Amino acid sequence: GAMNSSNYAELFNNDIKLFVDDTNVYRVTVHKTFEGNVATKAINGCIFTLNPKTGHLFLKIIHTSVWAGQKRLSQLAKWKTAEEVSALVRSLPKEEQPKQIIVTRKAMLDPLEVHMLDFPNIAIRPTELRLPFSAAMSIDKLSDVVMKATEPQMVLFNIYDDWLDRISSYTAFSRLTLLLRALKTNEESAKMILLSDPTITIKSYHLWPSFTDEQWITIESQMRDLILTEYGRKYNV
Amino acid sequence: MNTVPFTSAPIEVTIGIDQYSFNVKENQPFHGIKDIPIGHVHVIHFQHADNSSMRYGYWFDCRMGNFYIQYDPKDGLYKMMEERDGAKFENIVHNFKERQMMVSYPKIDEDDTWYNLTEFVQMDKIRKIVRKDENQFSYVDSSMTTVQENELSDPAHSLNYTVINFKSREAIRPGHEMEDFLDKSYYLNTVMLQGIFKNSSNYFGELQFAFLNAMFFGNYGSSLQWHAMIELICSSATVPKHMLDKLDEILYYQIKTLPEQYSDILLNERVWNICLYSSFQKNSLHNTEKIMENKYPELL
Ligand SMILES: CCSc1nnc(CC)n1N
Ligand SMILES: CCSc1nnc(CC)n1N
Structure with missing residues (x-):
């Protein structure tokens, strides 16, 4: 069901x-x-x-x-x-x-x-x-x-x-849905977060930047902040 | 005018004959029903005073034989039987009539109700829905399930109504998925009318028989079948004009006859609102819409 x-x-x-x-x-x-x-x-x-x-x-x-x-x-x-x-x-x-x-x-x-x-x-x-x-x-x-x-x-x-070479499908889906949720709530801010550091690039054969594991933790943190915020900016909290 | 005699009435029971009904007390001398109109099918039905569970009864046509009722104390029900000795039967009836213990089928002269409810219902078609070919009459009760219900468990005791399923390979042509699901005219006219029923009279007869089993026995699968057959017509953009006009009359008399206090379990809110207000035929059922709105405006 x-x-x-x-x-x-x-x-x-x-x-x-x-x-x-x-x-x-x-x-x-x-x-x-x-x-x-x-x-x-x-x-x-x-x-x-x-x-x-x-x-x-x-x-x-x-x-x-x-x-x-x-x-x-x-x-x-x-x-x-x-x-x-x-x-x-x-x-x-x-x-x-x-x-x-x-x-x-x-x-x-x-x-x-x-x-x-x-x-x-x-x-x-x-x-x-x-x-x-x-x-x-x-x-x-x-x-x-x-x-x-x-x-x-x-x-x-x-x-x-x-x-998937480094993480499980569960973790990969969680990362995907976090990225897309951020892009949906505030597209400009999300896209700024993803490309702010010009030294991290998107491979020709990829969709997202080539973040190290440590950089993904930082990135994912910044996306969570954005989503809770917008939820303040939206509801005023 | 024909007669269905009763050997006796050993248990207290409410007896129905068509849309009529009367109470009989335990061991009260009761000898049957006389003056039954020839030309129509009839149903004689029973609800015991001690167990409202199991309404049950018999569909019959007096032109097909001489039928009587006899209580069976082993199986615990009133059974219909056929008497093959014609002189024995005439003799039994004439004696019971001379002794005046028979209720007279109480038809008002002006009243076309039963005709209107059974216009297209034929015994030969009843006997194919209710399979028991050693009898000329057909037993139905509250608990019997339909073929389709059994697919989703005793086959001998099933109601073999025509299976209608809007999300099925029969209903939907390869390539016309959206077309056939949103407009069921293919399924109505080609699959069902031309292919299975052969004509609209047999379609209406099964629709009317399903309604009557729902009303008289509380048979849930019969109610499902009645609503499905209504919904298949109303969800077709292309229906012969004569069928739509006849459908409006059919439903009008069914809604008129329904017990006002059974409308909560015998009428499906979704089907009726879709049929009268959303469907292709929302404007083709004038009589049915007017009575529904004045009698059951809560449902809508
Ligand atoms: C409902 C049974 S018919 C019946 N019962 N008692 C009498 C005599 C008045 N009668 N005609
Ligand atoms: C209505 C059942 S669905 C179905 N039946 N045949 C095909 C092949 C096109 N298909 N998609």
């Missing part, structure tokens, strides 16, 4: 599972028309499909052409998400297919369930966690590949870089 604080270690066991976040699939700018009405203009989006054990990210880029001539786009976006996740599973070898798919928003449950009806043994689950995966478009290299796409495209990443 639902995924929450009490069954958190299940993410890092040896049953293949994927998180699916659809927040960034349908993205628009809202603007005024010459007549003074309001209109939207879509921009490229993405499905964020993540193996939390291995860090493998299946980033399906959603090009704006997929919305052309369609109605009720926020509803269509959930069904397009489920179509694409469905197609991804069907493309994987049997032994790589997930045993569970956890959706970050409950409105994805019925679309994904209907699309996966022939995979009766793959469990589709909601979660009670408020995960910060919407902030994935605050990672510069992910944002860059989404905005540059001129056609539908799947791009594969490891969102943990090489961290």
Whole structure:
């Protein structure tokens, strides 16, 4: 059933599972028309499909052409998400297919369930966690590949870089969700923290800076401070 | 007009015949029900005074045989049986009528209620939902489960209603996932009407039979089936005009007949609000919406 604080270690066991976040699939700018009405203009989006054990990210880029001539786009976006996740599973070898798919928003449950009806043994689950995966478009290299796409495209990443060589999946996921939570609460401050010291760089094949273990502790501390703060700045405490 | 005689009434019991009912006391001379209208199915049903658990009863059609009721003290219930000797039967009935211990099926001349509740219900279809082919009549009770309920446990004693499941391979075509889930017209018209039921009359007959078993026996799986068959029509954008008009009449009489104090357990808030206010057919059930709003505005 639902995924929450009490069954958190299940993410890092040896049953293949994927998180699916659809927040960034349908993205628009809202603007005024010459007549003074309001209109939207879509921009490229993405499905964020993540193996939390291995860090493998299946980033399906959603090009704006997929919305052309369609109605009720926020509803269509959930069904397009489920179509694409469905197609991804069907493309994987049997032994790589997930045993569970956890959706970050409950409105994805019925679309994904209907699309996966022939995979009766793959469990589709909601979660009670408020995960910060919407902030994935605050990672510069992910944002860059989404905005540059001129056609539908799947791009594969490891969102943990090489961290699993030094730390466990549990710790890597905790670091990821802390980074994304910070980027979501105050993007400018978070990004300042990550790049302030010009001597720490991002490898061409990585998403995040090449911090030593000691520097990650400092970094992680600064992100926690930011989040508690913003929570003061927000609520005044 | 036909007659269902009773050998005796050895235990105190409330007896129903269609939408009517009366109390019989322990060992009170009672000899049956006369003047039963020919042309309709009927249900005769029972609730013992000592154990309101288990309402049970029998669906029958007097054109198909001579039927009577006899209490069985071993199994502890009133049993329907068929009498094959026609002269023995006429003779039993005529004597009981001459002695005046039979309740007269109490139909008011103006009253079309029972017709309206059973318009499309046929005995031959009842006997396929309720499988017991050595009898011409069909036993139903409060506890019997449906085929679909058993899939989610005794098969001989099941209600074999047509399985309807909106998140199923039968309901959803490869490539039309969103289309078929949000508009069930494919599933209604091609899969169910053309494929399984063959026509809307058989669909309505099963819908009406499910309602009546829910109402008379408190049969929960029958209530589920009734609501599913309503929801499959209301969630279809494309329904023949004649079916929508007939559905409105069907439901109108079902809602009119429902005991006012059973609406809390026999009516599903979600289905009714979706059907009357959100669905494709939200504007096609004028009579049903008007009675629901005046009789059960709390539900909505
Ligand atoms: C409900 C049983 S029918 C019946 N019971 N006693 C009499 C005599 C008045 N009668 N006709
Ligand atoms: C409605 C059951 S789901 C389903 N059935 N066939 C396929 C292959 C496209 N699929 N996704």
